[PDB]
């Protein structure tokens, strides 16, 4: 009569454990490299009813795993092409005055130097055009010369974003919530599990999310401790706001041989007019989008507070300005026009003067760098604005007329908007159950 | 009547059903512990090896563990070990058909090593009696 124990194998059990995931890409490149195992186009998602699960945003190891993973890919892809050691020679530069707009006066610097040719016993005089943000007076030298010299982006291996699927190994499962009111952390009554996550674009930005996955129904303000101003506030929109970015210059590329089987590509001679790179966003759409953001944001703060917006709080060029990698050419753009408004309780575009820096310093690891060769002709961009990464200003008195400014810029936050749903769990098949059991003794 | 509580509820599907109804879904659980990486440089080379070895090692630990208990080769097996009633003073109907398994393991997770500490001793004993009967 007294109940005994029974051994149960495979019964569903979950334990919070995190390990190394795996990559899968859809049918050379920098992300996939045709190395990740292809994922079958039947992402069988299964809904678990009568269950609730806990999700810890900003503590998920998936965010950390992806951050370290792509950096390894970046280093891997930069090793096999020419280094730029011999480009640190003295630069005798000059201004550009051939059909120059007043807004970009003194930006490009026509330069000449005595960089070496392929033969070790001969020199050559080569002239190239460099942006103001790539040279420094000593007459000129490259900005990165006193820092470790960097390689040149392998011209062929484009950095165009490609969706990447993350799948856990056997014996582990990935759970994703589905409630449309999901906060940063809390139980979700619509738990589901899937072996592989949907396409995640690793596209880069610092202020405005580009090509992100939009929210389901309403604008969501996902944030940990909110009364603390020291942590960023992540906002995800619900209807995309189209963004146009273009480079008007008709640039041309010159190939200069540096050594045996090692070539360097320079800029110029430019053709046509000299016009500043600019981006465009609809005025009507942005005002509506911002109005919706404050409406939801006002539910977490005072209703009578006068919400204001302003540009960044200054600092290094890397974080103070919007960044993206459209068309393989980097743009640093001043977004003071998208935050110049005030909201009180109760014409088709914006001109954003952008900037181009040809020498790129990647993640704040200071020992690395890279060169991006120019691309012939004009470059056009069409992307979607899906959210913002704002920061809360301090010194507020009595919590009235609160304001936010764009900032942050850490790469982890960009993926957090895509990995907040997904968490990794471990399966505990073994188990013991009490019942009235009598083993058949031999 | 094609809809019966069975495998097609999905891998881990029984986690929302009662413990009694989850017994028939224990076969869909053991199958998804090895496969999934059958089809196939440092990055993703060592990672694939590390993931594959860990999955293989993890499954072995349970297969070994069931081997010492003598339940190996039977998905649902039991021994003659009684258990201290103080752990859970509940009836069979009060355990199987009225509560989910997920929160169950949490309550008795404290005595997982203790309850394991009785299974192997009896299995070795059961072998000893068979040896005595054998001789």
């Amino acid at each position, epitope marked *: 009569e007294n109940l005994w124990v029974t051994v149960y194998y495979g019964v569903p059990v979950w334990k919070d454990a995190e390990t190394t995931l795996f990559c899968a890409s859809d049918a050379h490149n920098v992300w996939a490299t045709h190395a990740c195992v292809p994922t079958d186009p039947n992402p*069988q*998602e*299964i*809904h678990l*009813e009568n269950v609730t699960e806990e999700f810890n945003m900003w503590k998920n190891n998936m965010v950390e795993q992806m951050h370290t993973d792509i950096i390894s890919l970046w280093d891997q892809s930069l090793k096999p092409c020419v280094k730029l050691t011999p480009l640190c020679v003295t630069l005798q530069c000059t201004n550009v005055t051939n059909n120059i707009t007043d807004d970009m006066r003194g930006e490009l610097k026509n330069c000449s130097f005595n960089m070496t040719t392929e033969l070790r016993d001969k020199k050559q005089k080569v002239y190239s055009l460099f942006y103001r943000l790539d040279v420094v007076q000593i007459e000129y030298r490259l900005i990165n010369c006193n820092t470790s010299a960097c390689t040149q982006a392998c011209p062929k291996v484009s950095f165009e974003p490609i969706p990447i699927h993350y799948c856990a190994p056997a014996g582990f499962a990935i759970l994703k919530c*589905k409630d449309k009111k999901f906060n940063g952390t809390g139980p979700c009554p619509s738990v*589901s599990t899937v072996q592989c996550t949907h396409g995640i674009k690793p596209v880069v930005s610092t202020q405005l999310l580009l090509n992100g996955s939009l929210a*389901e129904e309403e604008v969501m303000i996902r944030s940990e401790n909110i009364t603390n101003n020291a942590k960023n506030i992540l906002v995800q929109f619900n209807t995309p706001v189209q963004i146009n970015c273009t480079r008007p210059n008709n640039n041309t590329r010159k190939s200069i041989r540096i050594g045996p089987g090692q070539a360097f590509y320079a800029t110029g001679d430019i053709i046509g007019d000299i016009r500043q790179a600019h981006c465009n966003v609809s005025k009507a759409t942005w005002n509506e989008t911002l109005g919706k953001v404050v409406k939801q944001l006002r539910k977490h703060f005072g209703n009578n507070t006068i919400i204001r917006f302003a540009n960044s709080s200054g600092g290094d060029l890397e974080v103070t300005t919007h960044s993206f990698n459209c068309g393989g050419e980097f743009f640093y753009c001043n977004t003071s026009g998208l935050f110049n408004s005030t909201w009180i309780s109760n014409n088709d575009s914006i001109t954003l003067p952008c900037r181009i820096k040809q020498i790129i310093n990647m993640w704040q690891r200071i020992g690395q760098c890279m060169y991006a060769p120019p691309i012939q002709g004009v470059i056009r961009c069409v992307s979607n604005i899906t959210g913002l990464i704002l920061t809360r200003d301090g010194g507020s008195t009595n919590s009235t007329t609160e304001t936010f400014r764009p900032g942050g810029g850490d790469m982890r936050d960009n993926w957090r908007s895509e990995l907040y749903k997904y968490k990794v769990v471990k399966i505990e098949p073994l188990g013991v159950a009490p019942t009235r059991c009598k083993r058949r003794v031999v | *009547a*094609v*809809g*019966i*509580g*069975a495998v*097609f*509820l*999905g*891998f881990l*599907g029984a986690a929302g059903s009662t413990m009694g*109804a989850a017994s028939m879904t224990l076969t869909v659980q053991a199958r998804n512990l090895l496969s999934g990486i059958v089809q196939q440089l440092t990055v993703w080379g060592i990672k694939q090896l590390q993931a594959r070895v860990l999955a293989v090692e993890r499954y072995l630990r349970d297969q070994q563990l069931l081997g010492i208990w003598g339940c190996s080769g039977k998905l649902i097996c039991c021994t003659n070990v009684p258990w201290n009633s103080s752990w859970s003073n509940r009836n069979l109907s009060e355990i199987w058909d009225n509560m989910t398994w997920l929160q169950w393991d949490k309550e008795i997770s404290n005595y997982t090593q203790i309850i394991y500490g009785l299974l192997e001793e009896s299995q070795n004993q059961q072998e000893k009696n068979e040896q005595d009967l054998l001789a």
Partner: antibody
Amino acid sequence: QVQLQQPGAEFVKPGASVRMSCKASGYTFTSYWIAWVKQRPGQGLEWIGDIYPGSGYTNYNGKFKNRATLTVDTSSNTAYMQLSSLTSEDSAVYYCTRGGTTFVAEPWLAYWGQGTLVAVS
Amino acid sequence: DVVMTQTPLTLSVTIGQPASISCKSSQSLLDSDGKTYLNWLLQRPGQSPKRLIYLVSKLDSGVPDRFTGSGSGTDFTLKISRVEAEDLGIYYCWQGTHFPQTFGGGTRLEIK
């Protein structure tokens, strides 16, 4: 009210494909079974298939040798069916009917919709 | 599989008379749980199919007094006391225990 919205009618061409949708509203889509039914005017009702809007498990009739691919969406509460590439004699109306729960299964055929006229020509 | 045949292919009836329709199963449909999930649905001429009897002992909502489902094991029947325009149609006996969930062969009620 438990309703299964269906498209009115689709006119397709030989060698083409169709996206036979079936909207779910007024209930929980993650539990009830979903099955399709044929209503040829000159012939009796025929069993086409069944899709489980949960685990994604799919079952197909023996006579069909897996000629169709069944897909569901738990986010938008919709169900989809591929033919795939049917022919002329199979031009009739298909009904997306809601089944019962995988445990009880007694209320099968509880509710229907209006169907969609598939006329490949 | 278990086939579902019905004797009446054509049933000539005038308004105000009792109608009889029956169905057969090759194998007994008594499920282990102790129930018969057979359904008697009257498909309207061009409208969506509508069930009339489920769990033949039990009856559906909007109960019509004329319809009285009965039968177990191999024999299934549905007796109608009076005929109405709604009664004129096609009845299908649907088994609900084995695979596939085959419907009935169809019995037509028409006035000639």
